[PDB]
């Protein structure tokens, strides 16, 4: 159980570290898109990893060593933590995007 938590922690940290500066597209409130990456959260990696575990489905995927839905993880963590992201985003559209990705990544 302890060893499982360490493996999950390292797996999530691994995937977030590797994609830390990758820009993803999110829906703007007005029209169009804006870009965001983990780097812009201005959070330390330990806190980003903890917040990523609050995203439904991520712990299960990480436990299995599977690829995480990182656009959704970023969007959820940023929605939860970044006032700037919250003000920029069309949250109706973000919610549907995040749920679509969780559904895709929950497949077998």
From Swiss-Prot:
Part of the whole protein covered: 190 to 297 of 297
Gene Ontology CC terms, in alphabetical order: host cell; host cell cytoplasm; host cell nucleus; virion component
Keyword Phosphoprotein appears in the UniProt entry: yes
Recorded name of the encoding gene: P
Physiological role: Non catalytic polymerase cofactor and regulatory protein that plays a role in viral transcription and replication. Stabilizes the RNA polymerase L to the N-RNA template and binds the soluble protein N, preventing it from encapsidating non-genomic RNA. Also inhibits host IFN-alpha and IFN-beta signaling by binding and retaining phosphorylated STAT1 in the cytoplasm or by inhibiting the DNA binding of STAT1 in the nucleus. Might be involved, through interaction with host dynein, in intracellular microtubule-dependent virus transport of incoming virus from the synapse toward the cell body.
Entry protein name: Phosphoprotein
Modified residues (Phosphoserine): 21, 82
Gene Ontology biological process terms in this record: microtubule-dependent intracellular transport of viral material towards nucleus; symbiont entry into host cell; symbiont-mediated suppression of host cytoplasmic pattern recognition receptor signaling pathway via inhibition of TBK1 activity; symbiont-mediated suppression of host JAK-STAT cascade via inhibition of STAT1 activity; symbiont-mediated suppression of host JAK-STAT cascade via inhibition of STAT2 activity; symbiont-mediated suppression of host toll-like receptor signaling pathway; symbiont-mediated suppression of host type I interferon-mediated signaling pathway; viral transcription
Origin: domain of life: Viruses
């Amino acid at each position: 159980n302890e060893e499982d938590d360490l493996s999950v922690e390292a797996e999530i940290a691994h995937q977030i570290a590797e994609s830390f500066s990758k820009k993803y597209k999110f829906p703007s409130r007005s029209s169009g898109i804006f870009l965001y990456n983990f780097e812009q959260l201005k959070m330390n990696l330990d806190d980003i990893v903890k917040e990523a575990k609050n995203v439904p489905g991520v712990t299960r995927l990480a436990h299995d060593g599977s690829k995480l839905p990182l656009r959704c993880v970023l969007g959820w963590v940023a929605l939860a933590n970044s006032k700037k992201f919250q003000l920029l985003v069309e949250a109706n559209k973000l919610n549907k995007i995040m749920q679509d990705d969780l559904n895709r990544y929950a497949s077998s």
